[model samples]
Target: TRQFLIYNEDHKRCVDAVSPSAVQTAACNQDAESQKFRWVSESQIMSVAFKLCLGVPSKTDWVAITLYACDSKSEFQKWECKNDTLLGIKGEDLFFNYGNRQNIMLYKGSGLWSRWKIYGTTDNLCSRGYEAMYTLLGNANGATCAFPFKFENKWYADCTSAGDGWLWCGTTTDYDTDKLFGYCPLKFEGSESLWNKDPLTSVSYQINSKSALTWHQARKSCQQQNAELLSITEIHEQTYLTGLTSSLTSGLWIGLNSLSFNSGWQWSDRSPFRYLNWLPGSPSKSCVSLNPGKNAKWENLECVQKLGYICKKGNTHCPSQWWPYAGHCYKIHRDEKKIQRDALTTCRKEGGDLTSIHTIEELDFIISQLGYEPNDELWIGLNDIKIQMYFEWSDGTPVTFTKWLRGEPSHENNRQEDCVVMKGKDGYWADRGCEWPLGYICKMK
Candidate 1:
């Protein structure tokens, strides 16, 4: 690790340790010890003057960059030097950004103000003869590889030990302990023909037949690639996979499996096993496979049986300008307020419907999408307008979830409170009159 100065190219100023707890940009001064910093570790920046590491004030989004006592265990102190962009290692997208009044903060963007240059250090951080890997953000000249690292209780000197068939290595010497690793800057041989991204979910699928293996072997193979055996969550995904596997010659092992006869089936990815397309027969085995010739119908087979399998990779993505959570896209409309009925109509006109809540994770995601605590009520899709005391979602989905506030949906007054509105800092739902105009959220596939 070499000492260098963080110079914002756009502002033409150097990041300075203004105080023991503050950071900002100032005129470049080569002799200033406060401006002299070094990469103490693979992704940590330590100030030579203050003897502290540059980090965010908190893990929350949009926090200001501050100086803290150096700690290897603190991920907040880790910083990624991606060419001109200085990014935070804790969050994949957070960058060391220039805010108003020369303040340095962490934000999600890649504008001119976010780019910086490290003076007095070469771009390459890796040691001699070892090529640097590509970071998850697609940045070049990533952290140096720690060779002879331990993985799965075994030591490896080369990247071929990874089952993904791509080069990778631990950024720290003891990967078994630190668990810090990155993909080497090399593509898998013929990856184009091996992987395909699903149009609906945007998850990538890899069909590997290089060597057929048993169910357990296939699972391990996919796990090595940082993926899991294929698991279909929706009808469209099932149909898509059916068509996708039509060209294959043999049945492929999927992620479905039953531990015992009465334990019920489960997916490797832990997704809710809501959709099923089983063959017309009682399964007498613990593992399942998809027969492409049989329209991708699932059939149970012996766990020891060998077959080619598919691996699911990547994450679900939403349309641009929309927020994604649990495979659904949501958009909030705060510019205009409308009644519950009118809000549903507006959402329908936009090819969706007022948002519906299911799990608490979904609810938390919805609240976070607001960017801040909402000051007013926002209309959701739940309503009992059609049948008193019986609520249903405007999107026509089943209502299996609800987070009502205390004494909500009360009939103390004669006024009809049929529609549901999400409000308060906790984001609990309350029954309101359908005639009440409010901003609403829309959800889609």
Candidate 2:
């Protein structure tokens, strides 16, 4: 490994995190391996700003610089600016969806950085060790990604809900312009913030899942997780989350609920959001006490029966659209009308399967959507019949992700009662039979 600090052409220093030019080390274990770079600290310094520059017509080569010392500004270890996650200087026209997507198509690379043409899911992309990468540094042909994008990397992209609850691209002032015209932000706009200290509010909008949850439990779940269930009072949010696509997940839970004496779905933050996204039938007159557990037989059931649900909450600490520190979403659709098994069906459609909520804001967001609703226990995709009442989120995410109210997810019954429901910080939707008729919600990307 090579370690050196970069000084601007004028010899002006732009970076000063570490001054000690320590011995460089790399993960290159094999002798055939080429040189690679690595920063030993965790969640620490990575201010390699001086290490890069735009291509100049006469001298387009980018200057590689190394800084000494831990990057206090950084909150992670193993920082490598050259790695697409920490630092990348490419665009979709050449490296579409950098750090987020993968492709394998062999296209003539821009020859700026190592030319890379990925044509597979980002999850499976990989690079053939640094030895090959070092040799590849000069070659026009680039190397393949050796690993998937780190789910923990929050620096790669932002989920931008410019204002309100909608995700919109920023003005594009943050990225390098390259002096080239017709340039744009490398990422698309998104909604919702994950792993943030706050939950979904009017500012951050839109989550991945699409389905309903009992009002009480939803809000409680949100509060417990420092988040509120997703609510759509603005027309923009209503459209962004629901989408114009016919493949939208229907009968979703928004951050509006009729739980209090006021008895009507309202935003948790008490924001007067107004864009409505009620699928064909909604706001069912029938009280929450009863349910239409597949009894109604309609394509979209309005009854708040027992079901695994999805919720959206706002997060300011993180940008919208990038939940759980670069979290993702999956969208599932079925063309043919048929009965869904709820729990397992989510797997066939939304990404791997039903998802697990990662924040309290999400829990509350779902609760807020219950319209004066008082449904019996709903069936989330959780519940391990084979393992007894050890319920978990759909994706088998840890219970640490839940915001259940007191005595919640207890599985009061036995494996015979294989069902669970989310709860808000406040107590509600605490009990219900495993078989109770609720609904399910999930998302896919």
Candidate 3:
């Protein structure tokens, strides 16, 4: 009779239910069905198997696990929590022993895949194709979804779809960020695509039709030119890829492929996929290619297929001093500490201004890039130094978005704490002394 909340510490996420069987983690609301779990026992064991009791193994080292309810008593389904390290599933006949430390759990040691009866949808065509009405399922699995996520006998997307779309999940309590995924559709506007002028920081597509090549040969040709096969993450990237490969008579090989052991498609660059543009049906192959036509969309092809390919290069166009990511350049002043005013001045000298992040994705990018100490705080661009009433960015941009920590901007006229510092829990903003020296982030075009 004990209700439980399953958590995934790898990404600091939690398990929530999307369908009766499918579960995913989202920004913990502790309210939604997807976020709650119950230990329905034989006397609260859900049903006992192996007499081991289907309950969360109580241990800090068992970081990848969170929820454990009887999936019918013989086996347990745990989040295959692996990323960065110890990213693997471990279980055998419902028996688990560390046999070692937490570090071993992080390894890709041999283990069996856990199974659970979860609800997932098999709808190849989304309800509202290419519209904003898309719903982010907390969890999705290619396997379970085929069982058809039948929530109350209603078809829904698989819980594993979290990686496929904008999953409405995150660990933060940002009021507006309750959903972990974006509920947007993936449709290109037109043939024309946005272009960046900076050669070093721009993402450009190139195609080679001089010789039809296999996926391997195509991959090498791109690499020989210091480029790589087209790896699309969003619809925009696909637009550019399609536009560039339109001239080829045959399909152009892309960088999307599944590993030999698994069926998940990933980019050649090791970056995760964000947007999917399937061709109106279930994808049937492991490798993907952009159809060479006016209304180019997507097509799954074999790896051995000989075809023209497009290469994307120059995405990392940021200058030597700046780091390029997601079509932007940033400079994190990690070693040099500076006061708010001084930090702004230094960033200006480098032809950039203090960082002005507009979205959660941008915020996450900053955190990933900096990876500074837990106690380290930094000055951002937003401040009310000029007019305490109206905050503004150092570059003169409007303060449209703010991740102010709870009760932030404690505008005390006495201390002149007008400048914003990312200092609180989760790196949210807090007004601090303009004279306080701290590291800072700078942004460039």
Candidate 4:
């Protein structure tokens, strides 16, 4: 060390520059002589973010640090000088960075420590001397990884060693993510690492084709498209399957066939059925579409019905009732007493918001739900407050085919007409006012 500027005169503490030359002639040998030559040390810190691991007076042994919260009424207001230590080391044995710091978590109501976890390394020596292959310190408490992740197990870094090496210790931490928690509303923010990005999930579907084939053939055809047949598990899944059926009118064929088992309706999942919604009466073994007949009966439907059916991947998604058509849902109302609009507003909180149908196929699917026959239609999403040219579907599908029924949508000039509805037959639009009340449908994708 060179020029020494005295910062603490009585304690002999001073800013050091270079080496005090004369001392080398009588250098005292300590530790391994190389590691122990008498010299003042500039403390190096290792921590997760700003959190430090080592204390001022090194213990060089099995040691750990716990940080809690502070709660005194005055604690939040008072300010301290830079030299003020919030923690400090008591002795070589007991370390506290702020010598006067009382436990931070002692507050009667301070919930700050709820998500506490240690973030430091054990095999740490210095950045240049350590390799990633380190040990789990006593501070690491997470064993099961079931968070509120108890900062489980000794934290080891997946690191590599570098040069200038004495014992280069790693002082970096890669945090966990939101889904990492087993509870709702993750506990911590910021430094909570992204240990895992995506949670694990499974889904499956069945491909029911009119052309009958063996399980092997069926499975092969499905695999070609990276899909498979049905595997019903949870009731939550059944709701999802119902949604995918939005595009179809007739009861589509599922992987279920009593013809093979004669009595058991097996799902492609290879598991026993837990939730079944065969549309009232279904599985008509004869492969018939009791169309305009018992649409809600579960009679065995023959697999040879020459119909194309589908099953989800692993688990199901959006429930059957709210499934969108052509990737679009619906949201419409020919203003009635505005009751439906109010109802739509309230119901959206539970399911999806009012749907917005976009295409001819979509319009057709929803229309088919009521009937192919034209209806001056009750309530729909299409509306134009200004003029017919300013028409748009609920989800913004511009009314491209603007064919009106005769001199309909008349107001060529300015008018107060604000109500709107989509007519099934012409696919054109109509408008009235906010209080015109009508039936509206909702959908989700």
Best by lDDT: 1
Residue-level lDDT for 235 in candidate 4: 46
Model 2 is weakest, by summed lDDT over 10 consecutive residues, at: 132-141
Name the lDDT of candidate 2. Answer: 0.31
For residue 314, model 3's alpha carbon misses the true position, in angstroms, by 42
Candidate 3, residues 1-445: lDDT per residue as tens digits? 1233444333444444454332334565556544544332222222111111123443333433333423433233332323222223335222221223211122233232211211122221111121112221222100011111223323222222333233232211221333223221122242113222224347766554544567876676566545687776544566555655556556777887764432245667654343445554436456777777635666678789877676776645888778877777897787788888889999889888998877768887777675644576888887766644345678876444555554443434445436777864466667667888789988888
lDDT of 4 by residue, 240-293 (tens): 554544444444444444333222344454553323344432332522221212
TM for every model, in the order presented, reads 0.34, 0.23, 0.30, 0.23
lDDT agreement with native, every candidate = 0.69, 0.31, 0.50, 0.33
* RMSD, one per candidate, in order: 18.4, 23.0, 23.0, 23.1
- Candidate 1 wrong stretches, greater than 4 Å: 1-193, 260-262, 282-284, 316-445
Distance from true position, residue 401, model 4, in Å? 5.5
Model 3, stretches more than 4 Å misplaced?
A: 1-316
Model 2, span 279-372: residue lDDT tens: 2234432222211232211122333542222344453232223132224443222323222254457444434555455555654444454321
- Native RMSD of candidate 3 (Å): 23.0
